[PDB]
Design a protein around this ligand. Structure first.
Ligand SMILES: *[C@@H]1O[C@H](CO)[C@@H](O[C@@H]2O[C@H](CO)[C@@H](O[C@@H]3O[C@H](CO[C@H]4O[C@H](CO[C@H]5O[C@H](CO)[C@@H](O)[C@H](O)[C@@H]5O)[C@@H](O)[C@H](O[C@H]5O[C@H](CO)[C@@H](O)[C@H](O)[C@@H]5O)[C@@H]4O)[C@@H](O)[C@H](O[C@H]4O[C@H](CO)[C@@H](O)[C@H](O)[C@@H]4O[C@H]4O[C@H](CO)[C@@H](O)[C@H](O)[C@@H]4O)[C@@H]3O)[C@H](O)[C@H]2NC(C)=O)[C@H](O)[C@H]1NC(C)=O
Lengths: 105, 122, 133, 445, 446, 124, 126, 446
């Protein structure tokens, strides 16, 4: 039981690219496959980036993940007024790890 | 002068003058297709060569025997035979070609014992 | 077309057993392969996890911080799994969701292919749970 | 009577029997490997006089043996090639809209799936382009290949080519091929002028259904061949006296990329096209087609009444494999909706036309539910110049009183293309033994 | 007064040798034994009787049965090559006992099994069910696994073809001849006083069995007993009946066949839902006919051994299921029949029907090969095959018990002995036409 | 009387039947190769003794006469039993291991003869 | 047989005339070793029939040493006979003759045929 | 006065041609199949031919080329029934080794653990195996992967076959013959004074090598030099010498064999545990015998050049390790040895063991066929290899201006020179028994 590090607030403007990183402890590399989520205000969480970098067919092409060793990143290029929602970082060490959450303003 | 099977429609008096041209030319998935036909050709030539060789004509292209022609086999005159085609002549005897060879070998085998007898006297 | 529906009451007395049944529709034979999980979220904060339930055989893997506090049942006849947690307090005021654990099937002559992580593709609308008198 | 038997060695005696053949090439090409004896520089054509030999057509053994040969030639061509079984995968398979025209809307599909990498523990999302005639709906929808509920198959290896190389079918030893040289040779009947040929001329084993391409044309007049001209249930073979050029091309500068399907073995997918995309089409001039259509109907007045209305219509129907044209332009199998070539009528007494041609990549074309093939893409544009020479027609009879005697172009089977090419030959077996009465007597030593 | 040798080419002299054989069949859709690429048999039986000839025939030394064991397996592997493979079927089966109008003897015999397998595409799965027998399904630690899963991967063997034994004729090549011994009282090894040459042999049905001869050629007048040594303890002493006795082996279940797809063009056939009351597969033999047939061989066995000696029959001693049960074929489905009810016998000097329980297997090893197995497809409908049993494969036991109470039991661990009772009349010999002899020759010089 | 019909008779009786013994000496799947090798094996063996006979002074010639002096030690018999009493089959087993020396003496006794005809048509 | 197979190779042509028997006697003597084993056997028979029928249809069917009534073109070699069977060998003889050897085989075809035609007419009165 | 024609049959006449050969073994399983090979005749008649000459021609005859195609084809027929070894390309978590590791094996042997499917397809087990540094590549404890999986992965050799070289014979086909030479000075060309005729050859070793020829045919008296063009630098020089120096190539790592079952009837033979002390494999060669061998080759290289030039022996130039280092087979293994200590000497104008390191690569690849390969299974115990070095391959450096300081360096990137020196006497030739000569014949008409 250990929550993942995550910035509670991040600034968002249209036409740029933001980066969200989450990393707890990585003494033994067991959290190889990080998962990302996107939850519009309230409503239902969605899955945007799945096994590290893959995506479901139907989400926008600008969504892209990265696994740089022990650190993970999510990059969205060309922000708009509809993707400004919450994002979560999902990892796995013992059973299930959940992140705190973010906020695109 | 003519080539392979050149005189196949002429009279037998002139077709049989030069008949040795027909005898000298008797010899992957394409590899099996070729190999099957190469084996087929060597026994086709040797089947009737053995049939020729079992008689007294070992290598003679033209030879002669003492087996007499049966009157009921042909019932046809001789003077007009050498001056009409080979193929029309074949169809008139074709049914009984098997029994012609039967008495042709028994006289030949009894022939070889004949010179085995008087030549053994001295 | 598979919808993860929800049930459950509203106002509830604390320190007793509350029931939550989640029903899936478009399955028929699409229940034995995928795992099913319960995920809850307090308002204003991040998600929290509850435990597993088996697809066809039936397996009970739970969160290590909620042991001896919640039981999950399963029928494999109507595709309905029930969530029953006990010793609920005023700090457990949260909205509850039922989610489908995804699976990436692939088999070649040489062997089978297995998944890596616990990713959830299908979610539900959820139902908020309030702890009051 | 002084008559005694004698034997003759080296006599021309003709018997008819089934015969295996040879191979010959005109100096990888696995479609015709030609790992055989090369043909002679000068073939021996010997004309035979005073001979009337009967030749029979549609029961000849030459067409039946080579039909089995090309099937065996095809099966050996595909066993050293990569299997495409990791392609029955759910396809998130959609449209394409950039640089498209009106009638091509929906034919080409930008179509994606999941596929593995060197490790068999990591997947990736590759993309490819597929035609409408290659995928089928299941319910950005989900698609699957046509061959997924039928026999799995391979793709043709990219280095080998399927262009028609002329080959010679030559008789073995003790065996002969007779070539008739009659200008008005009817198929069913004896040929009064029969010549013998050791090894025949070049044969192009093209696989075509509607028309015939690159065949041997006639000498002076078009001819019509039929087993039963009264019957309407048999294919009508027509052989032209003059060639008509055809211009078929693909105007797409299509690229070709190769993705790793597994352990080193690769799958050559279709790359992204460059520039605008148009429809593949075939060009036939009107001036060289309407007059030769008058030639073929002129010979229809010698087998039927000349006071008869003759009509040309479309195909009867059925599946797409037989109702449209199908040929092998540069390793790409087009399917041409031949409708303007058979839309005419005749009363009892520059101008190139386009043909809509569609492209398919999974083609069966042997009536086999045991194997198929994926056609690899070809770099650049496709260009062919060919002559059409045969019209496999079908008499749509049933009516009486010699009225509206229509003809519908059929060609359901595929062995009638070669019946007009091996039309001059028949296998014979020579018997170099024979007997004759002779006055000779054998002397005894 | 003097002799000179002369050359004789084409005289009848034969020397023993070995070679390969041919194929021959009559009246032609697909067959595993006689394929379409086989020359048809001759239309006339060229049997030429010979005089003044005594030839020493020697069975168990000729390699025609060894050549039989060479080409049948070659045909057996060849039909298996262009077939659908069944390697993904030993994924863990979750099974249960079936109880739908079940009898006492079939309780725990059939298993209603269920597992997870691929569809035409390789990304969707379905929960499909099938039926399996107990003899090919074992435990793991309700989870069951196939018996072939820890051994070689193996297939279904193309149910469009049939395992029907069509009689085939082995024809001699050119320059050779086959000698047939027509002696009515000719035993295993020894001279043959009346032998007749033949170009090509008669019809031989390539049936396979381990205990009893099926559909074999009958004897002439008296049943024959053949062995390596009459005092031997092993090497499968065998007999051949002179009169035919019939057997009916039935499968009374209303079995049905469903198509379950492995994948693309990979059609696999599995057992569906049985209809009606299930009954054990059984084979019926007439009690009076079999007892008198056994009453004739007991008289034939009393002259090779001592007179006034009692013999007692017994069932199989032990081993695997392929040797302790009567294994044969019935319409394309393999049978493994218990044979204790026909071999309980005790006979003494001064001298309606019997049922046989029988179990059915789906996947078997036809030979001792470890590299392949065949999944017999479930074939539809009630099947009733009629056949004649005409021979026994017995193995005696040792022990000098005063030459009394001799034991006979059906064994047959070696399966190539089936064709020895069909090819016992024939041997392969090499014709040498050249010969020499001394005469008075004096070949003259021209 | 049929194929091999005189195999039990004496050499005198079986000398009228050499024709039928010399007439039957020619007559993808596993059968396609097995019957192919058996066919070429037969034509090779028929040719084996044909060239072995052809090197001597007779081609064909089912009754071939040869002036090699017969050795008495090989047989020690006479004409009263090798023509009227016993058969062809039992004749070979008496000379089975004498066949290497009757062959080897014959090609040189043949070879020393053509030199007499070589200078007969050359020194004429 | 005293020298062996292919013994008198570079010896005198007259000396090699007697040892012409061992060469004719020794003219005949699924894995990758199986196909070419059969290919060697079928080629040995085909090689043996490439010249036996070519010699058998001439005036002598099976004689070892043989000669026919077709006269020699003396302008071909223009050499004495006193070295052909005394000094000149078989190995250094073919290379000076094979430049035109294709046509000699043709002339013996019709020379024996007319000789056979003379024999056919010789039995007219008999 | 004129002459008359003649036909001669059976004359000795040779003309050059090409023909496929056939196998001949001594009848003693093997990857060099030998199970269906024709047994050889144990009497090669060495017929000496007098007053004869023959112009041989190396590097143009297809006798080495026809046998070259049989090298690949024989291994392909023995690799098809072997088990496929594709599905182990899952990611490999790899560690280093322990238990008294030395400096020479520091990081070469690796302990790797990875996931693997079992007999039940929906169940996996983790297994461990030992792999060399030249068997895995780096993916950026860390995750390694197989080197030959992004390239075309392949199978493993069956444990029943053995790669020991059986000396095979190539008997000439009927109607055809081969000739051998018995001279002292021998180019690639040249008329042979003493030509001998034989049908079946002596022992020819099919062993493969790249740097040093081993287990080859010994020379006669002295060291002869073979070259297509001795003035050219791109032509490989073949050198063979009379005195066979011995090499003792040992694998001092006592290892076990572990069977990891990868599927139904498919077993992958993994490496076990290295018991005892670990030491790098090496080859031992005598100091004195090797130097005088180099002293017995310097004399005959100076006769083809000037006596004032200085020759320098260095190591290979560079490139891939498989072509620039030694490679051979000893009991199923494939040794890669560094030969710097064998070719490091200079020659001016007029206790004793040399060691050299050796590496081990379990995955071996065909030199020309990159479409597949084969995996050599590990062999338990200690591998002992003793062999005779009979031939060397040397390549001259490019340039070599002023006709001085001509350095000789190793090379030989082709695999056809291993058998070119073993067939130095032999060349296939076609016989034609016909001939025409003038005479005084007058055939008597009848
Ligand atoms: C590469 O690998 C990836 C790995 O993730 C593959 O992705 C996965 O692919 C599988 C394919 O089998 C998917 O499983 C399927 O899930 C659906 C349910 O999900 C659908 O419905 C959701 C709810 O629908 C709402 O929205 C619609 C409007 O669209 C409304 O009309 C409804 O009323 C609802 O309000 C919907 O949310 C889903 O969308 C999600 O995913 C897409 C991407 O696909 C995103 O863009 C979205 O944003 C969102 O995140 C989705 O639309 C099931 O219904 C499927 O069941 C069918 O197939 C089963 C196969 O065994 C079968 O058992 C079922 O019975 C059913 O089959 C048939 O059943 C009935 C007959 O019995 C029929 O009536 C029925 O129509 C059907 O035909 C299936 O289980 C995974 O979800 C998916 N996972 C991810 C993360 O994407 C990918 O496909 C691979 N290939 C590529 C990329 O090419």
């Amino acid at each position: 039981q250990f929550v993942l590090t995550q910035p509670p607030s991040v600034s968002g403007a249209p036409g740029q690219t933001v980066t969200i990183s989450c990393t707890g402890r990585s003494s033994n590399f067991g959290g190889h496959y990080v998962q990302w989520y996107q939850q519009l205000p309230g409503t239902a969480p969605r899955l945007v980036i799945f096994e590290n970098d893959r995506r479901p067919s139907g989400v926008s092409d600008r969504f892209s993940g990265s696994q740089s060793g022990a650190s993970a990143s999510l990059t969205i290029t060309g922000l708009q007024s509809e993707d400004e929602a919450d994002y979560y970082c999902q990892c796995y060490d013992s059973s299930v790890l959940f992140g705190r959450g973010t906020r695109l303003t | 002068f003519l080539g392979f099977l050149g005189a196949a429609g002429s009279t037998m008096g002139a077709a049989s003058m030069t008949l040795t041209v027909q005898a000298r030319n008797l010899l992957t998935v394409w590899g099996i297709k070729q190999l099957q036909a190469r084996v087929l050709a060597v026994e086709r030539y040797l089947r009737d060569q053995q049939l020729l060789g079992i008689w007294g004509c070992s290598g003679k292209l033209i030879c002669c025997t003492n087996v007499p022609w049966n009157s009921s086999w042909s019932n046809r005159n001789l003077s007009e035979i050498w001056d009409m085609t080979w193929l029309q002549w074949d169809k008139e005897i074709s049914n009984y070609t098997q029994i012609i060879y039967g008495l042709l070998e028994e006289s030949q085998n009894q022939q070889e014992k004949n010179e085995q007898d008087l030549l053994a006297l001295d | 077309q598979v919808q993860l529906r929800e049930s459950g009451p509203g106002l509830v007395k604390p320190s007793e057993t509350l029931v939550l049944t989640c029903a899936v529709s478009g399955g028929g034979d699409s229940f034995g392969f995928h795992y099913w999980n319960w995920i809850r979220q307090p308002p204003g904060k991040g998600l929290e996890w509850i435990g597993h339930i088996g697809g066809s055989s039936g397996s009970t893997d739970f969160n290590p911080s909620l042991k001896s506090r919640v039981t999950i049942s399963m029928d494999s006849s109507r595709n309905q799994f029930s969530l029953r947690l006990k010793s609920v307090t005023a700090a457990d005021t949260a909205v509850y969701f039922c989610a489908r654990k995804g699976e990436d099937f692939y088999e070649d002559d040489y062997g089978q292919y297995f998944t890596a992580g616990w990713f959830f593709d299908l979610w539900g609308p959820g139902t908020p749970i309030i702890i009051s008198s | 009577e002084n008559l005694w038997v004698t034997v003759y060695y080296g006599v021309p005696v003709w018997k008819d029997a089934e015969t295996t053949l040879f191979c010959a090439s005109d100096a990888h090409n696995v479609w015709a490997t030609h790992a055989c004896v090369p043909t002679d520089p000068n073939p021996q054509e010997i004309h035979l006089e005073n001979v009337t030999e009967e030749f029979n057509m549609w029961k000849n053994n030459m067409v039946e043996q080579m039909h089995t040969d090309i099937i065996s030639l095809w099966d050996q061509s595909l066993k050293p090639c990569v299997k495409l079984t990791p392609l029955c995968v759910t396809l998130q398979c959609t449209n394409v809209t950039n640089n498209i025209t009106d009638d091509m809307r929906g034919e080409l599909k930008n179509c994606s799936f999941n596929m593995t990498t060197e490790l068999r523990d990591k997947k990736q999302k590759v993309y490819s382009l597929f035609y409408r005639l290659d995928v089928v709906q299941i319910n950005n929808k989900e698609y699957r290949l046509i061959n997924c509920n039928t026999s799995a198959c391979t793709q043709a290896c990219p280095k080998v080519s399927f262009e028609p190389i002329p080959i010679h079918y030559c008789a073995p030893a003790g065996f002969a091929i007779l070539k008739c040289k009659d200008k008005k040779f009817n198929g069913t009947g004896p040929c009064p002028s029969v010549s013998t040929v050791q090894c025949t001329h070049g044969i192009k084993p093209v696989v075509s259904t509607q028309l015939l391409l690159n065949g041997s044309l006639a000498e002076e007049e078009v001819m019509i061949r039929s087993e039963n001209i009264t019957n309407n249930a048999k294919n009508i073979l027509v052989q032209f006296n003059t060639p008509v050029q055809i211009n078929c091309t693909r105007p797409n500068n299509n690229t070709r990329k190769s993705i790793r399907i597994g352990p080193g073995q690769a799958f050559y997918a279709t790359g992204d096209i460059i520039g605008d995309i148009r429809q593949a089409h075939c060009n036939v001039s009107k001036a060289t087609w309407n007059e030769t259509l008058g030639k073929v109907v002129k010979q229809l007045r010698k087998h039927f009444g000349n006071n008869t209305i003759i009509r040309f219509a479309n195909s009867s129907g059925g599946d797409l494999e037989v109702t449209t044209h199908s040929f092998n332009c540069g390793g790409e199998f087009f399917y041409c909706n031949t409708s303007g070539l058979f839309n005419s009528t005749w009363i009892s007494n520059n101008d190139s036309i386009t043909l809509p041609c569609r492209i398919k990549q999974i083609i069966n074309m042997w009536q086999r539910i045991g194997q198929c093939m994926y056609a690899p893409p070809i770099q650049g544009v496709i260009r062919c110049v060919s002559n059409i020479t045969g019209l496999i027609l079908t008499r749509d009879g049933g009516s009486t009183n010699s009225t509206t005697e229509t003809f519908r172009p059929g060609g359901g089977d595929m062995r009638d293309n070669w019946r007009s090419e091996l039309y001059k030959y028949k296998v014979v077996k020579i018997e170099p033994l024979g007997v004759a009465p002779t006055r000779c007597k054998r002397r005894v030593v």
